[PDB]
Design a protein around this ligand. Structure first.
Ligand code: MN
Length: 211
């Protein structure tokens, strides 16, 4: 994994396809899935670093059954997490100006999360119900060979809070983006194996000022 500075022309063109897809799918449907976002070698390095963090005891309790650690990217042993964040930042930067009226110039740290099996999940909720500044939620999933029929842990998304449910498996190297506000209630269904993911929330500068 070459942890983005000197990408090839073919990679730039792929990256433009990705951002155009994100813009069109967020604006049209309120969410967007990208399969195989980083590739297996780089995704494996992200997962290895997440497990090392988890084994070191730095996670803390996150209604919700997750354990979390906030990673800015400059921590020892987190260079692959930093690389992930740089890739998502570049993706969002290519979309800014095209995502609603939002002015996206910043984000949270990476929220590394584990639902440690045991039937744990997160009930239906809205990430940003109260104008807290967060406009786009980004999930990066890290679970190899995950069969949700056995492992549970699907994300159930309710676009536009209507009757339709979208059931999303938390599969390795999958990126998911969705509007953080009341347009996208969602729930993490109970997990029966250790379930790992990283979340980044991107801010709308004008709303984030409020808090
Ligand atoms: Mn959520």
């Amino acid at each position: 994994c070459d942890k983005l500075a000197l990408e090839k022309t073919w990679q730039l063109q792929k990256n433009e396809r990705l951002s155009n897809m994100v813009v069109n799918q967020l604006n049209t449907n309120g969410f967007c899935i990208i399969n195989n976002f980083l590739g297996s070698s780089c995704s494996t390095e992200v997962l290895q670093q997440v497990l090392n963090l988890y084994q070191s005891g730095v996670f803390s309790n996150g209604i919700r059954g997750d354990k979390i650690a906030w990673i800015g990217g400059d921590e020892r042993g987190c260079e692959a997490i930093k690389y992930l964040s740089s890739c998502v930042d570049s993706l969002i930067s290519r979309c800014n100006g095209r995502l609603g009226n939002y002015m996206i110039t910043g984000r949270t740290k990476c929220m590394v999360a584990c639902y440690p099996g045991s039937g744990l999940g997160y009930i239906r909720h809205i990430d940003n119900p109260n104008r807290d500044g967060r406009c786009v939620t980004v999930l990066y999933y890290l679970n190899p060979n995950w069969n949700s029929q056995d492992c549970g842990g699907q994300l159930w998304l309710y676009p536009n809070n209507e009757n339709k449910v979208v059931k999303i498996d938390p599969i390795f190297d999958r990126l998911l983006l969705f509007w953080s506000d009341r347009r996208n209630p969602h729930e993490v269904k109970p997990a029966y194996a250790m379930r790992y993911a990283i979340t980044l929330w991107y801010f709308d500068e004008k709303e984030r000022a409020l808090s």
